[PDB]
Ligand binder design. Structure first.
Ligand SMILES: O=C(O)[C@@H]1C[C@]2(C(=O)O)C=C[C@@H](O)[C@@H](C2)O1
Ligand SMILES: O=C(O)[C@@H]1C[C@]2(C(=O)O)C=C[C@@H](O)[C@@H](C2)O1
Ligand SMILES: N[C@@H](Cc1c[nH]c2ccccc12)C(=O)O
Ligand SMILES: N[C@@H](Cc1c[nH]c2ccccc12)C(=O)O
Ligand SMILES: [Mn+2]
Ligand SMILES: [Mn+2]
Lengths: 83, 456, 444, 84
């Protein structure tokens, strides 16, 4: 029907938003990795626990239930998986 | 011949005594200075008492530590830096036992292997000290087996009778550890309940949610599959401490003969014993004592160790090439672990020794803050284990275990964690007789994070 | 045969729809032969099943039922039976992880040889295929004749199938770690494997956790698969009735052609044979209800099929179509729960969502099959009641009968390997996918 | 020590703005997804479309690798809800 044509241009907009999320995740990942290299090249730790928790908790404050998982992904991409 | 010969047959050991005289005549760092007569007499008493562990337990542990060393299990060791007689109480021992059992559940899920559980307990009463004194020519506290905490001449006299106090406290502590672990404290589901509360109440709860849920589904899956909780209602906790005090460790030497007839010498003050950083001189008492006892052995190696030295310890302490006999405990600092350890591991692996590689991220990361309290930052403690793991993944070797100083009390001793402890928090509940321990929350947080390292 | 005899004469004195017209004297000879043969299952098994089904209805377990829409003698082979068995078990391990409860595993097998037809004859005067227990697939006068001797052939085939099912499940085909390796090679090979990666990784970590905890158990090497089929053909079903005497001394009447029997949507008249036969037997019973059911009609079935208020005894099988399940089921559930019966609520997301495609083939869209089970779970979550199970038609062979899934089967693909002798079945891939998605539904 | 400090404070506030952007993107995505869901279901269609979900998940993995599916999963669960 007419409602199928609308769905196609709503999906078209999701796609553009998916490109944006994905472009920004990449960029974010580059920057987190650099902070890592800059703290580590001067005898610092790979991970900073309070900074990690803060972002995770603020993501939950912002989107709810999935916040921690969303933040966990960005944290894993940016400082690597632990171990 | 066989049927004739069968009816005819029906109608201080010598090697050990060599090695034992060699060992006793070696120099011994970090000893007290007390009357030789009194000392001997106390050893005579302690030569006759029930040991703290029996030899077949030690043989069972050796089989488990061999699994660890071969990549099939993980070693969790930890507890108080220094036990004291005043604190050697039911609630406190229970607090630590639980914390360690709780950590072990998470680590087992993360390793996908058994975790061997070794408490710093039932004998950790001696400590190394830089000089014999120094404040005002008054003797330094060397732990409750040598003298008292109180800052007076009478309390600080080195007292040999404290070796009997220590044995008695050790005995009581092991009795309780055994009792708790067989009567419900080590129930897997009760412990998971305690982990679930930790997560629910942590200000960093969301850091652990998803691993905690996943563990939970793991538990519920067992029960769904029809698993009887025979294996799951109890667990073995092993004791360990630093073999430090000459007079005490020799007085607990026991001969043990196994099922195939083979006679061995054990120090039965503990299942496992280790040699400190400050006492590991290759010609000295401690390394040579550990070389002549059948107990599994640990050795603390700091950031000055070379690979050449690593190998030679391995040859001295593991001369019959027995997997897990010897555990190499790296305590290098978070900033040194990634530089020093690789070379150590490569030479040792190449020499055909199969040791347990263990991370002690506490003793290389200790510092003195503005207010004068000794402390350790959570992030630096975590980073040393993290770097230890990184090295192992690069070399393709097995990250064997961790050795951490913690308590099941809500202390304020180490900085960081979710509770965000800072310089100003430390004098709230600073209770350690010696080094800054992880508290209950920090200990559980660390188990979740080391769980993630294992899963990688 | 005293209280029972009154009730049996009443049952057989009633109309039965969907029967074959064959010589009755022949049918009666065939029934006398089948009355002496070893049953397909024994009564202690059915008693065990009923304890397990009680656990399902009380919210401590989940029923997974499925298999061929229609078994044929031609297809009753080791490979085909192993294939369905494997798939059922693989599904069950994933569902067990999602449910956090045991899954009772119930195969449509060893007797699903009869099917209901709308017209007895076709427009050119040829009798329709009613199933291999009545006549042949081959569309000729001779092959379509209703042959009562096929009852013996069905019995022989069912015996063989059920013999094999027992052999496979006791000899390593039902080993938990072997099933999980097959799931792992499903995930690694699916075009939608990335949809299932995380959940599969979680299960494996769970498996390796049991091993690390020192769980050495024969529980994990084997599993029970119960057989079921639609109790349709009067003569076969009554000839498999057997009296079984209990441990405490009670005589019960069972139909031992299967552990579980159900009543189809086209044979559930309250006044008719099938409902009254089901009331008589002590096997657990299912009943298919469609979109036209009323809450009152549902409560009348519960009173009659579960007269002694035995949890798990009755399974109500909702086959309503995805577009109606959210409207029709809630009221049915409330009425039956309020009437005090504890039934198993099961979804059949297959028979309410069939249609004929542009090329002539009957098919089902994976999305509509999923949406019905999804909706069923939504209704249960709202009401606070227990989703009891699912009933799905599938095969462990690479068929092209249902549209959708990870492989995006379309109209054009249907003629490739369309093999079902009746309704469109989910292929292996679609079945394994459905297990994962339903596991997420169970997890919420 | 003070130079590596100051830079990390800038990089962090720069991470924060990228997080604001990702968060804000996710929120509008999720409106649109829901809106598609209502539209399709109000006209007698299914809550979920599998092929469509599978393709996004597969796009995400092709673009960022390892974490691809988990990110897409978060967005799907945000869009159309948890299953069940
Ligand atoms: O110090 C930091 O700020 C950076 C960035 C990081 C992130 O990815 O957001 C946040 C905390 C640290 O663990 C890592 C990762 O270093
Ligand atoms: O049909 C759709 O396009 C929408 C959007 C959606 C998403 O969130 O990306 C993608 C697929 C569907 O299952 C749902 C969720 O409806
Ligand atoms: N027998 C156990 C475990 C098990 C073995 N094989 C299985 C196959 C599927 C599900 C579970 C299992 C059970 O039924 O729960
Ligand atoms: N006895 C098993 C399972 C278990 C019981 N209690 C535990 C406590 C922690 C870890 C595991 C367990 C084991 O130690 O492996
Ligand atoms: Mn210490
Ligand atoms: Mn069918």
């Amino acid at each position: 029907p007419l409602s199928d044509a609308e769905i196609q241009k709503y999906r078209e907009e999701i796609n553009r938003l998916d490109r944006e999320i994905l472009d920004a995740v990449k960029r974010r990942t580059k920057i987190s990795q650099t902070i890592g290299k800059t703290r580590m090249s001067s005898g610092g730790t790979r991970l900073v626990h309070t900074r990690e928790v803060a972002i995770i908790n603020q993501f939950r404050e912002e989107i709810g239930e999935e916040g921690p998982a969303l933040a966990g992904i960005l944290l894993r991409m940016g400082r690597g998986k632990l171990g | 011949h066989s049927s004739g010969m069968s009816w005819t047959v029906d109608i201080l050991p010598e090697g050990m005594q060599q090695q034992f005289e060699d060992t006793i005549s070696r120099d011994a760092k970090q000893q007290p200075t007390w009357d030789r007569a009194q000392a001997e007499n106390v050893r005579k008493i302690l030569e006759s008492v029930p040991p703290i562990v029996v030899a077949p337990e030690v043989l069972e542990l050796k089989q488990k530590l061999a699994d660890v060393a071969n990549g099939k299990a993980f070693l969790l060791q930890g507890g108080d830096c220094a036990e004291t007689f005043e604190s050697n109480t039911e609630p406190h021992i229970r607090a630590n036992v639980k914390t360690l059992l709780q950590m072990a559940v998470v680590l087992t899920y993360g390793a996908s292997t058994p975790v061997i559980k070794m408490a710093r307990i039932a004998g950790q009463y001696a400590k190394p000290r830089s000089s014999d004194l120094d404040g005002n020519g008054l003797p330094n506290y060397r732990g409750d087996i040598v003298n008292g905490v109180e800052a007076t001449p009478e309390a600080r006299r080195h007292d040999p009778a404290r070796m009997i106090r220590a044995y008695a406290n050790a005995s009581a502590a092991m009795n309780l550890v055994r009792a708790l672990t067989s009567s419900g404290t080590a129930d897997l589901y009760r412990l998971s309940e305690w982990n679930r509360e930790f997560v629910a109440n942590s200000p960093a709860g969301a850091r652990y949610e998803a691993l905690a849920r996943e563990i939970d589904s793991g538990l519920r899956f067992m029960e769904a599959c029809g698993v009887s909780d025979e294996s799951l209602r109890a667990a073995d906790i092993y004791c360990s401490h630093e073999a430090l005090l000459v007079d005490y460790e020799r007085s607990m030497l026991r001969l043990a003969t196994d099922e195939e007839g083979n006679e061995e010498l054990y120090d039965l003050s503990a299942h496992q014993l280790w040699i400190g950083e400050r006492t590991r001189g290759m010609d000295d008492f401690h390394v040579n004592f550990a070389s002549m006892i059948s107990n599994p052995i640990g050795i603390k190696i700091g950031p000055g160790i070379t690979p050449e030295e690593a190998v030679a310890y391995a040859d001295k302490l593991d001369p019959n090439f027995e997997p897990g006999r010897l555990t190499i405990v790296a305590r290098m600092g978070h900033d040194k672990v990634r530089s020093v350890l690789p070379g150590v591991i490569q030479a040792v692996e190449a020499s055909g020794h199969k040791v347990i590689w263990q991370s002690d991220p506490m003793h290389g990361n200790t510092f003195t803050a503005s207010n004068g309290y000794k402390t350790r930052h959570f992030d630096k403690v975590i980073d040393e284990v993290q770097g230890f793991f990184e090295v192992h993944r690069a070399l393709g070797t097995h990250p064997g275990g961790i050795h951490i100083e913690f308590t099941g009390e809500d202390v304020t001793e180490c900085l960081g964690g979710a509770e965000d402890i800072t310089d100003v928090d430390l004098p709230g509940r600073y209770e350690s007789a010696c080094d800054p321990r992880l508290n209950t929350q920090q200990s559980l947080e660390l188990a979740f994070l080391v769980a993630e390292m294992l899963r990688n």
